[PDB]
Protein backbone atom coordinates (compact mmCIF):
# COMPACT_ATOMS: atom_id res chain seq x y z
CA UNK A 1 0.00 0.00 0.00
CA UNK A 2 2.92 2.47 0.64
CA UNK A 3 3.72 2.55 -3.46
CA UNK A 4 1.79 5.45 -3.95
CA UNK A 5 3.10 7.67 -1.43
CA UNK A 6 6.07 6.45 -1.86
CA UNK A 7 6.02 7.54 -5.54
CA UNK A 8 4.29 10.51 -5.29
CA UNK A 9 6.51 12.43 -2.39
CA UNK A 10 9.50 11.14 -4.32
CA UNK A 11 8.65 12.54 -7.91
CA UNK A 12 7.29 15.92 -6.33
CA UNK A 13 10.82 15.93 -4.47
CA UNK A 14 12.76 15.41 -7.33
CA UNK A 15 10.67 17.66 -9.65
CA UNK A 16 11.29 20.79 -7.67
CA UNK A 17 14.95 20.53 -6.61
CA UNK A 18 17.68 22.82 -8.00
CA UNK A 19 19.10 22.36 -11.12
CA UNK A 20 16.33 19.84 -12.05
CA UNK A 21 14.74 20.06 -16.04
CA UNK A 22 12.25 18.10 -15.47
CA UNK A 23 12.24 14.09 -13.92
CA UNK A 24 13.14 11.97 -16.65
CA UNK A 25 11.88 8.60 -14.76
CA UNK A 26 10.93 7.35 -11.65
CA UNK A 27 10.71 3.17 -10.59
CA UNK A 28 9.16 1.87 -7.40
CA UNK A 29 9.72 -2.05 -6.79
CA UNK A 30 8.03 -3.45 -3.83
CA UNK A 31 10.48 -5.81 -2.18
CA UNK A 32 8.52 -7.34 0.90
CA UNK A 33 7.47 -4.40 3.02
CA UNK A 34 9.89 -2.27 1.48
CA UNK A 35 9.69 0.03 -1.74
CA UNK A 36 13.18 0.03 -3.99
CA UNK A 37 12.96 3.37 -5.79
CA UNK A 38 15.07 4.76 -8.61
CA UNK A 39 14.63 7.64 -10.17
CA UNK A 40 16.50 9.94 -12.98
CA UNK A 41 16.31 13.62 -13.52
CA UNK A 42 17.12 16.14 -16.53
CA UNK A 43 19.83 18.45 -16.06
CA UNK A 44 21.65 20.80 -18.29
CA UNK A 45 24.42 18.92 -19.98
CA UNK A 46 26.65 21.59 -19.46
CA UNK A 47 27.22 21.93 -15.75
CA UNK A 48 29.91 20.41 -14.13
CA UNK A 49 29.79 16.77 -12.93
CA UNK A 50 30.69 18.01 -9.85
CA UNK A 51 27.23 19.92 -9.52
CA UNK A 52 24.74 17.30 -11.03
CA UNK A 53 26.45 15.04 -8.41
CA UNK A 54 25.58 17.00 -5.55
CA UNK A 55 22.12 17.62 -7.13
CA UNK A 56 21.84 13.84 -6.95
CA UNK A 57 22.99 13.83 -3.60
CA UNK A 58 20.95 16.22 -2.23
CA UNK A 59 17.61 14.57 -3.57
CA UNK A 60 18.80 11.53 -2.80
CA UNK A 61 19.23 12.78 0.67
CA UNK A 62 16.16 14.23 0.90
CA UNK A 63 13.93 11.52 0.02
CA UNK A 64 15.56 9.05 2.39
CA UNK A 65 14.43 11.68 5.00
CA UNK A 66 11.14 12.58 4.04
CA UNK A 67 9.57 9.26 2.91
CA UNK A 68 8.69 6.36 4.77
CA UNK A 69 9.06 2.91 3.76
CA UNK A 70 11.48 3.80 0.72
CA UNK A 71 14.80 1.63 1.56
CA UNK A 72 16.96 1.95 -1.19
CA UNK A 73 16.91 5.36 -3.42
CA UNK A 74 19.04 5.99 -6.38
CA UNK A 75 19.13 9.35 -8.42
CA UNK A 76 20.73 9.44 -12.05
CA UNK A 77 20.99 11.98 -14.25
CA UNK A 78 20.15 12.34 -17.39
CA UNK A 79 21.69 15.64 -19.69
CA UNK A 80 20.07 17.85 -21.38
CA UNK A 81 20.62 20.81 -24.33
CA UNK A 82 18.94 23.90 -23.01
CA UNK A 83 17.46 26.20 -25.30
CA UNK B 1 3.38 20.38 -16.29
CA UNK B 2 3.06 17.25 -15.00
CA UNK B 3 0.65 14.33 -14.87
CA UNK B 4 2.47 11.36 -13.86
CA UNK B 5 1.81 11.48 -9.91
CA UNK B 6 -1.98 10.98 -11.08
CA UNK B 7 -0.47 8.48 -13.56
CA UNK B 8 1.02 6.55 -11.67
CA UNK B 9 -1.21 5.97 -8.40
CA UNK B 10 -4.01 5.28 -10.70
CA UNK B 11 -2.76 2.31 -13.03
CA UNK B 12 -1.06 1.28 -9.65
CA UNK B 13 -4.23 0.64 -8.15
CA UNK B 14 -5.92 -0.74 -11.39
CA UNK B 15 -3.24 -3.34 -11.71
CA UNK B 16 -3.09 -4.49 -7.99
CA UNK B 17 -6.85 -5.19 -7.92
CA UNK B 18 -7.40 -7.29 -10.88
CA UNK B 19 -8.20 -11.06 -11.03
CA UNK B 20 -4.57 -13.15 -10.35
CA UNK B 21 -2.71 -10.43 -9.29
CA UNK B 22 -1.00 -11.13 -6.00
CA UNK B 23 0.85 -8.10 -6.37
CA UNK B 24 2.54 -5.59 -8.48
CA UNK B 25 6.44 -6.12 -8.73
CA UNK B 26 7.09 -2.82 -10.14
CA UNK B 27 6.32 0.15 -11.50
CA UNK B 28 7.71 2.60 -14.04
CA UNK B 29 6.48 5.95 -15.37
CA UNK B 30 8.88 8.18 -17.96
CA UNK B 31 7.87 11.24 -19.24
CA UNK B 32 8.36 11.79 -23.08
CA UNK B 33 7.33 15.64 -23.63
CA UNK B 34 3.94 16.32 -22.71
CA UNK B 35 3.45 12.55 -22.41
CA UNK B 36 3.88 9.82 -19.89
CA UNK B 37 4.88 6.08 -20.85
CA UNK B 38 3.76 3.32 -18.28
CA UNK B 39 5.27 0.21 -17.71
CA UNK B 40 3.83 -2.45 -14.81
CA UNK B 41 4.75 -5.85 -13.57
CA UNK B 42 2.80 -7.95 -11.82
CA UNK B 43 3.31 -11.32 -9.58
CA UNK B 44 0.77 -13.95 -10.40
CA UNK B 45 0.82 -17.84 -9.96
CA UNK B 46 4.08 -19.68 -11.15
CA UNK B 47 1.55 -22.33 -12.40
CA UNK B 48 -1.16 -19.73 -14.46
CA UNK B 49 -0.84 -21.01 -17.91
CA UNK B 50 0.70 -18.42 -20.64
CA UNK B 51 -3.06 -18.06 -22.19
CA UNK B 52 -4.48 -16.92 -18.67
CA UNK B 53 -1.27 -14.47 -17.72
CA UNK B 54 -1.58 -12.90 -21.48
CA UNK B 55 -5.47 -12.44 -21.23
CA UNK B 56 -4.78 -10.61 -17.34
CA UNK B 57 -2.02 -8.70 -18.75
CA UNK B 58 -4.33 -7.57 -21.59
CA UNK B 59 -7.09 -6.92 -19.57
CA UNK B 60 -5.29 -4.87 -17.21
CA UNK B 61 -3.85 -2.89 -19.83
CA UNK B 62 -6.97 -1.66 -21.60
CA UNK B 63 -8.60 -0.67 -18.07
CA UNK B 64 -5.28 1.32 -17.80
CA UNK B 65 -5.48 2.86 -21.13
CA UNK B 66 -9.28 3.37 -20.69
CA UNK B 67 -9.26 4.87 -17.39
CA UNK B 68 -5.74 6.49 -16.61
CA UNK B 69 -5.84 10.25 -17.98
CA UNK B 70 -2.25 11.08 -20.20
CA UNK B 71 -1.06 7.89 -20.22
CA UNK B 72 0.41 7.33 -23.68
CA UNK B 73 2.03 3.62 -23.82
CA UNK B 74 1.40 1.18 -21.83
CA UNK B 75 2.97 -2.12 -20.93
CA UNK B 76 2.42 -4.96 -18.51
CA UNK B 77 4.28 -7.90 -17.63
CA UNK B 78 4.06 -10.47 -15.95
CA UNK B 79 6.49 -11.98 -12.86
CA UNK B 80 6.35 -15.93 -11.47
CA UNK B 81 5.83 -16.41 -8.24
CA UNK B 82 5.70 -20.16 -6.48
CA UNK B 83 5.28 -20.15 -2.94
CA UNK B 84 5.09 -23.60 -2.04
Redesign the interface.
Do not use: D, E
Given at each position: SH??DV??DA??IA?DSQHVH?????????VGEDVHLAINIYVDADLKVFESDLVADAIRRKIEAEVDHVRDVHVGVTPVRIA
Open positions: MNLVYNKGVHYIRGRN
